[PDB]
Amino acid sequence: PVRYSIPEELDRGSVVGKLAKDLGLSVLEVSARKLRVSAEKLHFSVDSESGDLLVKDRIDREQICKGRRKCELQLEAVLENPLNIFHVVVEIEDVNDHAPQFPKDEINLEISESDSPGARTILESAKDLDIGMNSLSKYQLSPNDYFLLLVKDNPDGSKYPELELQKMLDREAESTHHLMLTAVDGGDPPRTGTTQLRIRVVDANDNRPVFSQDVYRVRLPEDLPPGTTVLRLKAMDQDEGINAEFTYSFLGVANKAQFSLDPITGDIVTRQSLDFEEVEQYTIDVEAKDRGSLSSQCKVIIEVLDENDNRPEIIITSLSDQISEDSPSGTVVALFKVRDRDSGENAEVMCSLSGNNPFKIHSSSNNYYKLVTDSILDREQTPGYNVTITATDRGKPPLSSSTTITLNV
Amino acid sequence: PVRYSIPEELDRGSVVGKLAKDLGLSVLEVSARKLRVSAEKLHFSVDSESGDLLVKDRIDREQICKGRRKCELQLEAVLENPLNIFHVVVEIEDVNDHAPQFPKDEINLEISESDSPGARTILESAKDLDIGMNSLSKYQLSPNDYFLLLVKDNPDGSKYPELELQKMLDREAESTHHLMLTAVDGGDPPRTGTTQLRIRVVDANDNRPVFSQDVYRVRLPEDLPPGTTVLRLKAMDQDEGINAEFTYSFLGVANKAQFSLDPITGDIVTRQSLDFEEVEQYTIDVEAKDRGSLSSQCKVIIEVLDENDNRPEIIITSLSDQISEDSPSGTVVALFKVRDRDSGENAEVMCSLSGNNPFKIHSSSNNYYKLVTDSILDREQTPGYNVTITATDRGKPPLSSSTTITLNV
Ligand SMILES: *[C@@H]1O[C@H](CO)[C@@H](O)[C@H](O)[C@H]1NC(C)=O
Ligand SMILES: *[C@H]1O[C@H](CO)[C@@H](O)[C@H](O)[C@@H]1O
Ligand SMILES: *[C@H]1O[C@H](CO)[C@@H](O)[C@H](O)[C@@H]1O
Ligand SMILES: *[C@H]1O[C@H](CO)[C@@H](O)[C@H](O)[C@@H]1O
Ligand SMILES: *[C@H]1O[C@H](CO)[C@@H](O)[C@H](O)[C@@H]1O
Ligand SMILES: *[C@H]1O[C@H](CO)[C@@H](O)[C@H](O)[C@@H]1O
Ligand SMILES: *[C@H]1O[C@H](CO)[C@@H](O)[C@H](O)[C@@H]1O
Ligand SMILES: *[C@H]1O[C@H](CO)[C@@H](O)[C@H](O)[C@@H]1O
Ligand SMILES: [Ca+2]
Ligand SMILES: [Ca+2]
Ligand SMILES: [Ca+2]
Ligand SMILES: [Ca+2]
Ligand SMILES: [Ca+2]
Ligand SMILES: [Ca+2]
Ligand SMILES: [Ca+2]
Ligand SMILES: [Ca+2]
Ligand SMILES: [Ca+2]
Ligand SMILES: [Ca+2]
Numbered sequence: 001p002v003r004y005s006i007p008e009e010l011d012r013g014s015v016v017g018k019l020a021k022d023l024g025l026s027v028l029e030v031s032a033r034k035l036r037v038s039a040e041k042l043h044f045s046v047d048s049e050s051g052d053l054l055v056k057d058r059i060d061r062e063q064i065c066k067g068r069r070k071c072e073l074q075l076e077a078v079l080e081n082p083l084n085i086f087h088v089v090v091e092i093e094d095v096n097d098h099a100p101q102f103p104k105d106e107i108n109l110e111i112s113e114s115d116s117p118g119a120r121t122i123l124e125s126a127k128d129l130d131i132g133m134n135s136l137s138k139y140q141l142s143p144n145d146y147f148l149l150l151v152k153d154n155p156d157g158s159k160y161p162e163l164e165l166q167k168m169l170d171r172e173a174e175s176t177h178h179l180m181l182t183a184v185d186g187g188d189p190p191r192t193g194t195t196q197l198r199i200r201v202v203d204a205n206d207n208r209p210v211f212s213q214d215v216y217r218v219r220l221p222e223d224l225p226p227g228t229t230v231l232r233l234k235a236m237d238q239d240e241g242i243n244a245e246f247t248y249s250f251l252g253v254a255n256k257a258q259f260s261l262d263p264i265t266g267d268i269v270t271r272q273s274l275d276f277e278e279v280e281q282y283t284i285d286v287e288a289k290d291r292g293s294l295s296s297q298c299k300v301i302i303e304v305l306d307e308n309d310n311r312p313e314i315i316i317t318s319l320s321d322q323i324s325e326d327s328p329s330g331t332v333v334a335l336f337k338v339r340d341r342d343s344g345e346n347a348e349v350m351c352s353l354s355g356n357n358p359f360k361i362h363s364s365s366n367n368y369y370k371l372v373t374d375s376i377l378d379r380e381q382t383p384g385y386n387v388t389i390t391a392t393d394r395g396k397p398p399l400s401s402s403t404t405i406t407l408n409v
Numbered sequence: 410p411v412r413y414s415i416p417e418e419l420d421r422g423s424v425v426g427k428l429a430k431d432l433g434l435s436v437l438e439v440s441a442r443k444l445r446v447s448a449e450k451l452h453f454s455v456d457s458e459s460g461d462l463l464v465k466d467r468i469d470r471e472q473i474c475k476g477r478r479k480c481e482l483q484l485e486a487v488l489e490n491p492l493n494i495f496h497v498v499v500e501i502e503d504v505n506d507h508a509p510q511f512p513k514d515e516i517n518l519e520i521s522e523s524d525s526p527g528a529r530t531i532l533e534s535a536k537d538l539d540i541g542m543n544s545l546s547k548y549q550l551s552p553n554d555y556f557l558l559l560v561k562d563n564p565d566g567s568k569y570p571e572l573e574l575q576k577m578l579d580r581e582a583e584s585t586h587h588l589m590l591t592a593v594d595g596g597d598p599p600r601t602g603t604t605q606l607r608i609r610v611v612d613a614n615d616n617r618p619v620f621s622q623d624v625y626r627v628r629l630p631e632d633l634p635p636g637t638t639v640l641r642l643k644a645m646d647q648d649e650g651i652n653a654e655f656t657y658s659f660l661g662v663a664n665k666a667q668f669s670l671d672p673i674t675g676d677i678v679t680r681q682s683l684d685f686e687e688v689e690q691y692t693i694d695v696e697a698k699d700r701g702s703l704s705s706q707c708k709v710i711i712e713v714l715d716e717n718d719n720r721p722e723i724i725i726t727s728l729s730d731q732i733s734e735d736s737p738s739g740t741v742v743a744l745f746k747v748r749d750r751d752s753g754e755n756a757e758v759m760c761s762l763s764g765n766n767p768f769k770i771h772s773s774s775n776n777y778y779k780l781v782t783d784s785i786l787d788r789e790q791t792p793g794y795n796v797t798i799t800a801t802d803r804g805k806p807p808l809s810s811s812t813t814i815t816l817n818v
């Protein structure tokens with residue numbers, strides 16, 4: 001079988017080979033014996049003047065050999081009187097007329113933010129119908145910090161790219177990445193096909209809901225009626241959607257007796273009345289946690305302001321029913337103490353007597369006062385005496401309590 | 410004012426201090442002068458024999474002083490004939506009888522696996538009713554690789570512990586962590602209160618569903634009836650529950666026209682019949698993605714096996730209807746070739762004549778046959794001839810086509 005090697009995509013009329021000269025026939029025999037050439041799906045023309053094989057149709061190697069590495073066509077030469085048949089093998093060389101191209105212009109991707117480094121994603125394969133060196137050679141990707149491109153060859157023999165993640169993604173810093181991907185063949189000069197991949201990072205629950213303040217400080221008067229909304233907590237979750245829906249809760253145990261907390265709204269209200277004498281300061285550990293159990297905690301301290309709601313109490317320690325009227329000057333008559341549960345200015349007290357009696361007030365020790373008689377009296381002058389002592393605290397509103405004592409001579 | 414310092418929680422009858430020895434009163438004067446002691450709602454007893462100050466009630470510093478940093482009680486001593494009043498101050502020393510303790514014995518915690526390192530979680534504060542050095546001193550945590558303990562102070566002055574995570578958690582490696590937290594006061598000897606921290610690691614979607622094989626390869630004959638389950642993909646997600654429910658989908662484009670994939674069962678089935686002459690091999694990129702966007706991809710490769718389903722067709726290239734009666738032996742009369750779309754042994758063919766005709770077969774090359782006449786015949790014997798050529802295929806089951814041609818002399 002005579003063999004003729006020609007490249008594909010040759011213009012009509014180009015010469016394949018001297019078929020008549022190779023067969024040993026002359027122009028006279030080519031004209032006399034009807035010379036025809038027959039292929040499977042191709043047609044060739046032979047002119048009577050030259051007697052050589054000329055191309056009659058456009059030959060696309062990728063159409064006929066369709067990925068066969070070595071390409072050949074089986075032609076037949078028919079002659080008449082006497083009719084005879086001959087076989088010609090024509091090897092078709094590939095030309096780099098087809099550039100690599102992607103199935104889609106843009107590739108849209110979704111990569112989870114929680115994707116571990118080193119993870120790989122398979123990308124769309126670039127197709128190059130050419131074979132051999134003119135086929136697809138390598139892939140290259142635009143430079144970036146996150147993705148490094150790998151070229152793997154699938155079982156058929158083609159080349160497909162996959163992405164190896166170098167660093168963990170973070171949509172809270174960069175939501176999406178737009179990259180340019182190129183595929184180059186091994187030609188001279190080589191050809192490039194480009195697709196622009198648009199990667200979208202979906203939210204991953206990797207950010208905890210953080211409060212606006214690490215510590216919240218409020219001040220309240222103890223006369224605050226229960227049910228009042230004392231505070232509204234502010235917190236934000238840098239994530240998105242499910243990963244950003246959080247609730248507030250009382251981390252402290254048994255401390256919900258004095259305060260109530262709406263978990264969704266994050267506001268703290270008073271369950272019951274506050275008493276400065278009972279609890280002066282509150283410390284509440286409040287937590288914010290999303291549906292993914294990511295939580296951050298902060299402390300809310302509450303300062304209760306003292307109000308003058310407790311009247312001062314007089315407690316007579318001891319008293320002498322019978323005393324002498326002609327007793328010496330400054331004679332002690334009764335011993336009593338003044339106690340007030342309040343604190344600060346609400347605890348300071350001032351007490352006074354009537355003044356008509358000869359008795360006078362004196363200060364001996366803290367929270368204790370002695371009632372004495374500065375001037376002696378006659379039993380005939382005044383046998384019995386009633387005295388009303390008033391103890392008033394000056395913090396607003398000032399409050400006073402009185403105690404009436406009877407002394408006999 | 411005489412001052413006597415005694416620790417709290419001393420048994421009744423214990424001596425506070427020799428008040429008479431400091432005052433210099435005599436035993437006879439102790440009996441004569443009624444010596445009385447009066448405190449704020451507290452009672453102390455003095456026996457006439459010794460003449461010293463003895464306790465009559467139990468003294469609990471935390472109950473009466475309720476957290477005062479320095480606590481003292483003001484008692485009063487009364488004598489008769491001559492009646493006198495004196496002031497005595499009793500400083501109550503604190504005793505380390507209350508150990509620090511947490512509000513709850515066990516603390517149950519939920520920490521997301523995706524919690525970043527260095528994150529801190531505030532824990533419940535330990536309360537110590539003692540005041541001063543005997544109060545709470547420091548916190549310490551059981552040793553482990555994951556959590557490091559920090560001691561921080563809230564505005565009131567108390568001490569609360571918070572946990573700083575040293576290394577990333579992993580529920581797929583360790584589901585839960587059980588730790589012991591202790592709070593120690595500054596006493597001699599010091600006392601410890603313990604709370605049991607039970608940390609449970611909540612699942613985070615940090616594992617992508619991985620296939621049982623990176624590439625799946627199956628081989629199929631083209632006569633495979635559609636609807637046949639060609640493959641069943643196997644993949645697992647190491648996460649838990651929602652984060653582990655994934656589906657399979659055809660990531661490859663336009664290749665779903667010939668194949669269908671049940672996502673729940675993970676089944677790959679054939680939509681339509683396969684043809685070896687059309688497509689020899691299929692390559693489909695299939696993806697598996699959970700309820701998040703964590704996805705893994707794998708390649709499925711299908712090799713189509715050629716079956717003898719196309720019968721060979723005989724095509725007569727050329728023929729001379731009229732031939733000379735005096736034609737010699739071996740005179741060529743017809744040219745024909747056999748075409749079979751199949752490949753391999755399914756493409757090899759064998760042709761035969763009727764046998765009634767005198768003609769014989771010759772081969773010009775493979776799949777091309779020349780019909781000649783081996784023995785000369787007389788025109789008067791047989792003018793015309795019908796000959797039916799049979800072409801049989803060698804692939805099992807063999808397929809044959811016949812073609813009848815007529816020759817006239
Ligand atoms: C054989 O050829 C003759 C004419 O030469 C024709 O009449 C006859 O029908 C043919 N045989 C068959 C089976 O048709
Ligand atoms: C794509 O890139 C290649 C080099 O890799 C060029 O040769 C080609 O022309 C196209 O610009
Ligand atoms: C692919 O496409 C890019 C533009 O998107 C070109 O710059 C490149 O040379 C190749 O043709
Ligand atoms: C503040 O918010 C509470 C609900 O948390 C209300 O009950 C209150 O009346 C105020 O609006
Ligand atoms: C708890 O631990 C402390 C030391 O950390 C001891 O001093 C205490 O008595 C208790 O055992
Ligand atoms: C609390 O309890 C633990 C045992 O559960 C002790 O080891 C610790 O010293 C503290 O007394
Ligand atoms: C394989 O599995 C598929 C599941 O749809 C079936 O339809 C088929 O018949 C074979 O059992
Ligand atoms: C050729 O042979 C096949 C059997 O292989 C027949 O079915 C056909 O009719 C022809 O005779
Ligand atoms: Ca071409
Ligand atoms: Ca080409
Ligand atoms: Ca090319
Ligand atoms: Ca993030
Ligand atoms: Ca996020
Ligand atoms: Ca979150
Ligand atoms: Ca009050
Ligand atoms: Ca008050
Ligand atoms: Ca008051
Ligand atoms: Ca005690």
Ligand SMILES: [Ca+2]
Nearest residue numbers: 504505506539
């Ligand atoms: Ca104590």
Ligand SMILES: [Ca+2]
Nearest residue numbers: 507539543594
């Ligand atoms: Ca203690």
Ligand SMILES: [Ca+2]
Nearest residue numbers: 579580581615
């Ligand atoms: Ca994990």
Ligand SMILES: [Ca+2]
Nearest residue numbers: 612613615648
């Ligand atoms: Ca996990």
Ligand SMILES: [Ca+2]
Nearest residue numbers: 616648652699
């Ligand atoms: Ca998962």
Ligand SMILES: [Ca+2]
Nearest residue numbers: 684685686718
């Ligand atoms: Ca077929």
Ligand SMILES: [Ca+2]
Nearest residue numbers: 719749751755
């Ligand atoms: Ca066949």
Ligand SMILES: [Ca+2]
Nearest residue numbers: 685716718751
């Ligand atoms: Ca076939």
